[model samples]
Structure formats: structure tokens, C-alpha cells
Target: NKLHYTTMIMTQFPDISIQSVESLGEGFRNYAILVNGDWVFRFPKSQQGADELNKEIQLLPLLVGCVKVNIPQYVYIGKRSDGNPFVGYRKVQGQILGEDGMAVLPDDAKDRLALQLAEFMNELSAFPVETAISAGVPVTNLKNKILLLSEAVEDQVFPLLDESLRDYLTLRFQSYMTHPVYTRYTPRLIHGDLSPDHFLTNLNSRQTPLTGIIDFGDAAISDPDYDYVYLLEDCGELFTRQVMAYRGEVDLDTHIRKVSLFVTFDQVSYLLEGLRARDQDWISEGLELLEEDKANNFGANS
Candidate 1:
């Protein structure tokens, strides 16, 4: 089925040569490939993913030439013999600045990454709120996901969580709904998933900047702070300091709540996927984080 989807893309974009096609990373929706050293093709594995890809295909071009950073550009869209659509874009260079990459960077490199990311976020947040809303980009908020997770927990979909952590999350979820911590700033186009893995840094050059952002697949219009939450979860305190320096003020409580919810969601999602795939290592890591959060009293109201 994966090959069938990719073959359709090659047929549609005959001008672009394919040197090799290889799987890029772990994800459920699609298969990724490096094509001709100039572009990457992402072909959806199912109809749901194809539909989501269609949304990104329609929305990403509106971002081109509007911001300084590179968002995944729309290159080609094609449907396979089975009627599934695949999206392709010119592959941008540079490595994802994830935990592994961050560990390799010197302290100075990390600082540069922080400031550049801040500037990028500010620019992205400045996109006209009215235009973004009109485009039907969903705004990121804590309440919807919290409610969903609470329901899942009640249904026993998430296993191995302690009573205290579950109760803490429920109370925090209610508090946030009743009195949201951060006021709604004008909704703007955001990366929607600004995890370090989504960023590519040109560390070799004197500029030492973030060269490109990939996988706008999760892009949306949302509270600006939602973009910054990854800094807390992925890079820890030093990254937090850099963000504070750039933003000039840090809402510690808001950041904590957002990070808490994000970690909970991410860990649970990982666990579920790993279980389905029968991958013990991912399942173990997911459980460890879940247990650690429970032990640390993550959502307790101080």
C-alpha cells in the first residue's frame, strides 16, 4: 500500500527524479521519502491521513513569502490507484534540533537557537488574526484536549496512572476551564506543533540560525503561547531562560500547566501507539514518564 501511494506521486511528478525512497521516522499516518536530494514526499497511509494532508496542502501556500522562516511548501498532490492523496514538497536542509541534536550543541549554539525561535514565533503570531480565523484554522486551547483526556481516563483508556495524578489533572482541567490562565491573544498562524524535532538549524554557518521548519502538517491558528510550550518540555531550563530573554516576561504558572497537559497527552499517545505496534521499548518509556509525573505530583495546586 505504501509503495502503491508513492508510485502514484512519481507518476504525477515525472520531472522530479527519484534517487531513493526511504522511511524517515516513526508516525502512523504516512510514509516519508527523500526524493532526488531536493524534495521529500509524504504519502498518507490511510484516508483519514489523506484528508488531513489535504487540509495542509490547501493551507500551507498561504504562509509562503509571508514569514521569514521556511514552512513546508506545497509542491505536488496526487491520488493513488486506491484513491488516496499524497503531498510532496522540496526538502529543506539542516537537522532537526531535537533532544539528540540539542545535546550535541554547545551552550552558545543553544542560546542562538532560543533567540531565533523566539523571533520566529513572534513573526508567526503577527499574521492577521482575522485572515487566519476566516481560513478556518482551529485555535489551540487546553480545555478541549483536557476534557477528552479526562473522559479517556474515566473510560480506562489510559492505564498505569495513579489516583493522585488523575485527580490533580481533573482539578487542574476544571480550574483552567473556569479561569483560563492566559488571555486569548489574537489568533494567528502558528506551527501548531513547534516541537524541537520540527525545527532545522543551520549550525555550520556564521548566522547560526533556524533554517527551516518542516511538518506543517499540524499547523493551526492558536494561542501564541502554545507554540512556546515545547521549549519547556524538550530543552528544559536553559531553553526556558532563552525564551524568557526573548519574550521579556515568563508566565511560569501558565507554562507549567501547558507543559503538564502536553506531556500527559504525548506520553499517553505514545503508549497507545506502541501497544498497537507491539513495541516494548516505546511502551516502557511512556510508562516511565507517566509514573514519574505521578510521583512528582504534576497537577497539585500549591
Candidate 2:
């Protein structure tokens, strides 16, 4: 049987004819399939994705009983007839705790979300650092990612960015390279992207507890602080409140600046790729943000 039919039969559901294939997320590579009901099949959209998937297949299981959060268990992994590898796991059901979800969450509920994330981080940081390094997973240094972005920006992917902001990012990248943000904390199997969209929550519950963490595509060996960048940027003050609730102290000014710099670099890197691919929307959105940030003086409120 063909791969699609094989997958359909394996799930024991009537093959409802490959109705449509939808690009689920903003990811550069990899695609998710929406079957008739309650299932999604994920496949690599590029060769690099295939390589990354292989790494995840090898490493995700190692994280099974180690982390506090529930990750998708690998059900089946195989190559399509054309040679691309596709992996399937049980589809998790819950709302993504994104901006929309956060808007509805009460202040205390948001605090709970922060605390839960911190607790998960605490558990994640406890994972042996040596195991991750031995596995050849990429190290998690925001500085490195920043430098990568700076080089791309200098190459004029978004030439419209303010000179000062660009210069600041350049200096920040240098500081990160030399000074380093994270100290001698144990390296852990870091979720390369820990954004709200990756976290599923049972909002109906009193605490709005986190249910599952999906999209391990970016999992790697890195500093735990890199994960905080997404949460800190996306959640803003709510994130700060949560960190304080969990850790009993808040360096709001410093963490926000660090995370902003990290995210700015991330966005620039993303814009560079999108522009290289001639993705007009990607380039436009990135440039718009650059202009907006410049207009607002890049939020140098600190």
C-alpha cells in the first residue's frame, strides 16, 4: 500500500480520501496534515527537516520520563515512496495558550501559567548536561543565534531597519559572545522554541494547568535561559509576574532587555530567510516591525 493509505489503515479509520493538506504553522520546513477528524500527520517539508526529525526521533524518547511535561510519543516513522520521512504520533487535543488564550486568563491564572512554566524549566534544567553534549545536539547560546542574525542583517535582508537599532544589536551580539548570559548552569535538553503556541493548556481548569508540549522539532542541547526568551517576550509583564511568583525574585528590567535582544535577532534571522525565499509577506511584516520599533525608539524604557 502507498504511504498515505498505509497510514490510514494503520490508524484503523476509513481512508476518507486525502481531502486536503494544510500548512499548519509558520515553520520554514515541515507540514502537518489534517485528516477527516482528530488526527494530523506530520512530514518534513525539506531535506534539512528530515535530518532534524531523525535527531528528534533519537532524542525525544530520552526525554520521556525525564521532563515534567508530556511530549508526543513517537508512534511510527518511515519514508514516503519519494524518500521523504514522515512521522506520526497521537494528536493532542487542547487549545493553544497563545495571545488569545492569555487575554482570557485572569491575572492570577497568568501567574499560574508562569509558575508552571518555571517548574517545567526547573525540571528541564535538571536533565544531565553531558548527555546532551555527547549526543551532538547544538548548544543553546542566544549569543550565537544573535551573531548569526547580525551577519544576515548586515547582508541587507531588511535594509530599512534603523541604524541605531542595528548598531545596538551588533554591540549586544558582541557582549553576548564575550560576556555570556548564562553562567555555569547545567545544560539541559532545551526546547528550542517554547512559545505559547507550543504549550497546550486546560484553561477550563482552575489553575489553567499546562497539558502537553508539542513541536519538539527544535529540541536541542542549550542553556535553559534561551527557552525563557520566547515566554518573556510573548507574555511580557505577565511573564515577569510568573517568574517572580515561582522564583521569588524578579529582574524585570534585565530579563526583558535580554529577551528583547534575543527575539529581535530571531526575527531578523527569520526575515532574512523569508526574503531570500522571496516571501513577500515575510519581508513586509519584518520591515513593518523594524519601522515600528524605530518609531518607538525600540522600547528602550529601561
Judge candidate 1 at residue 150 and give its lDDT: 61
Best by TM-score: 1
lDDT string, candidate 1, 50-110, tens digits = 7667767766777776667777886777777677677777787787777677767776777
Clashing pairs in 2: 140-222
What overall lDDT goes with each candidate model? 0.67, 0.65
Model 2 scores a TM of 0.80
lDDT of 2 by residue, 1-302 (tens): 23554464355434335454444454655766555444466777788887777777777787778777677776756566667667766666677788556667776767777777777777667777777656556676644556666677787763655676667556555544554443334466777878888888887776647777887778777655567767655666556556645754456555555555566566666677778889898888877765554443344532
Predicted structure 1, TM vs. truth: 0.82
Winner by lDDT: 1
Candidate 2 global CA lDDT score: 0.65
